[PDB]
Every structure is written in C-alpha cells, then in structure tokens.
Design a protein around this ligand. Structure first.
Ligand SMILES: Nc1ncnc2c1ncn2[C@@H]1O[C@H](COP(=O)(O)O)[C@@H](OP(=O)(O)O)[C@H]1O
Length: 295
C-alpha cells in the first residue's frame, strides 16, 4: 500500500544516473554500504544475466548441491544491493547486513557509483555483459511487467530512450565499458551472456576458479544441468513466480522470457536495426570490448 505511490513513476536520478523511483530515496544507505572483503558482487546492466550468474554462484558455494539452492527464492538468497520498497519490505542493504559471509550481492549500478567500500575492500566482482540489442528487448518487456518501472510506452520510443541512456541505470554503453576498464585496478571476472549460452560448463568453470572453488566433474555437471534456461524457468526458486503480481505482472511478460541469444531479430525493425548499428559503431569506437549479437 505505502509502496504504491512509488510504483510506475518516472525515473529519479542518483549521481546523474536514472534510478528506479522506489530505490532512490534514502540513497545514503547505498553510498555508505559496508562491504566485507569476502563479498562476491554480481554486477550487470539490467537483463544481462544477473539471475543466471547469481544462481551459478550460489550453487558453487553450496558445493554443487541443487537442493541447497531451493531453500529460498533467488531474490532472497542474493539480495539486490540497491533494492527498496518503501513501507512494504526491508531494503536490500538491510537484508545484506544480516547475511553470513560469503555474501553474494547483486547490483546493476554502473562502476563509478557502486559503493566505494566495494572497491576499497577489493571485493571479487563478477560482471556479465550481454549484447545491447537483446538487452534492450529484454529490458523493454521487463518494464511492461515490472511495476517498479516507469511504463515504457511503445517499443520504438523505448528503444530511443535506451540508446540515449535514459532508462533505469543509464547508458548501456557506459555500463559495460565502465567495468571492462575498472578491471585494471580491481579483481573483476567479466563474463558474456552469449558465452554462457554457447558453452555453460566452460563459464561455470571460470566462475568457480575465480571464486577459488574446486568442483568435481559431478558437481559441475549438476550445476550445468540446473542452470539451463529450462531448469530455471520451471524452478520457482529462480523464475520469480513468487513475487506478488502487484509488483511483477507475470501475465504481461514472464521473467524467464525466451532466454536465447538473437531474439532482437524478432523485435528490431529493419530501420531500427540500421539506425542502432550506426549509433552503436559510433558509441563503441575506441574500445576492444566486443559483443556477439548471434551465436
Ligand atoms: N539460465 C538462463 N539461461 C538463459 N537465459 C537466462 C537464464 N536465466 C535467465 N535468463 C534470461 O536473462 C534475462 C534476465 O536477466 P537478469 O537476471 O539480469 O534480469 C532474461 O532474458 P530474456 O528476457 O531475453 O528471456 C532471462 O530469460
């Protein structure tokens, strides 16, 4: 009830970044967040594989036992750092304060406004990038169904907001590039959603090594089996079907939507794809960071 007035409102702004309206008040809780050096941060631009990687990290920390991961929804097992629902739930930061190490922290903040404490404590960051076209489709449908978001209107107007960085958490170009560069000064494992669709066990292995964990071949196969898109769409612990429909309208668009690489071809018009590609080449000039739009 109290949170209703924050739902479906236009973006606020925190440190020059568009922010979910409900998340923006009381932002000192984020700026002053107290990290621990053993914290694992799962950082992504929205709709780039946060839930996927979070479940993989949790599974690795439980020794590859999928039963352990069903003790709670992924939204509670891996709290989102900046999440808040004023008057309805405790913030993500308050939940994380009461969580035993090793904490898994999910966040969508760009690198330059991720809380300083994370950088000073050298916390291991697992970043996931996804090609901007699939992200924009996924983010558009997410906004149609997630009532925390300002309504996206039509797809063509949303896409224009997306390319301009006028969506929640700002420019995708600055986001993916910010963490790609910050790895020169911080332990960052930079993953690619498309690499995970192509070869999931290979990417789980890289996450396990980064976390200093050793997996038997059985544990690895068990983690690959339960972190398929099909395993996670039907798992109530990962598919967000436990979120009340008042906050996430699962009928409009399910959270576990398509889970593929290349869905952008079913939504980008011929003209949209031409304009997006020129702007993308302009905006992604001068970086060695490369994304794949098909595999
Ligand atoms: N195990 C998995 N395999 C593939 N895609 C997955 C996945 N788990 C989630 N996804 C996809 O990742 C996106 C959500 O990313 P995030 O967790 O950061 O919000 C959605 O993309 P789609 O909307 O294209 O289906 C969702 O379907």
């Amino acid at each position: 009830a109290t949170v209703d007035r924050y739902l479906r409102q236009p973006w606020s702004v925190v440190h020059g970044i568009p922010m979910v309206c409900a998340f923006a008040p009381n932002w000192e809780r984020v700026d002053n967040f107290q990290s621990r050096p053993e914290d694992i941060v799962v950082a992504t631009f929205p709709k780039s594989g946060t839930t996927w990687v979070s479940e993989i990290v949790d599974m690795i920390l439980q020794g590859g036992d999928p039963e352990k991961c069903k003790r709670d929804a992924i939204v509670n097992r891996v709290p989102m750092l900046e999440f808040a629902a004023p008057g309805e739930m405790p913030t993500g930061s308050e939940v994380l304060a009461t969580m035993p190490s090793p904490r898994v922290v999910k966040s969508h903040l760009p690198a330059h406004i991720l809380p300083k404490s994370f950088w000073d404590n050298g916390c291991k960051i697992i970043y996931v990038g996804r090609n901007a076209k699939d992200v924009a489709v996924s983010f558009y449908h997410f906004d149609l169904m997630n009532k925390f978001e300002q309504h996206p209107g039509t797809w063509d107007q949303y896409l224009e907001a997306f390319m301009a960085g006028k969506v929640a958490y700002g420019s995708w170009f600055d986001h993916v590039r910010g963490y790609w560069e910050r790895r020169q000064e911080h332990p960052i494992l930079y993953l690619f959603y498309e690499d995970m669709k192509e070869d999931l066990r290979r990417e789980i292995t890289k996450v396990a090594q980064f976390l200093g964990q050793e997996l038997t071949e059985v544990a690895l196969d068990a983690i690959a089996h339960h972190t398929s898109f099909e395993a996670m769409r039907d798992n109530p612990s990962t598919n967000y079907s436990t979120v009340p429909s008042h906050l996430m309208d699962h009928g409009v668009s399910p959270f576990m939507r398509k889970g593929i690489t290349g869905d952008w071809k079913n939504h980008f018009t011929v003209a949209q794809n031409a304009h997006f590609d020129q702007y993308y080449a302009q905006k992604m000039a001068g970086t060695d960071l490369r994304f794949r739009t098909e595999i």
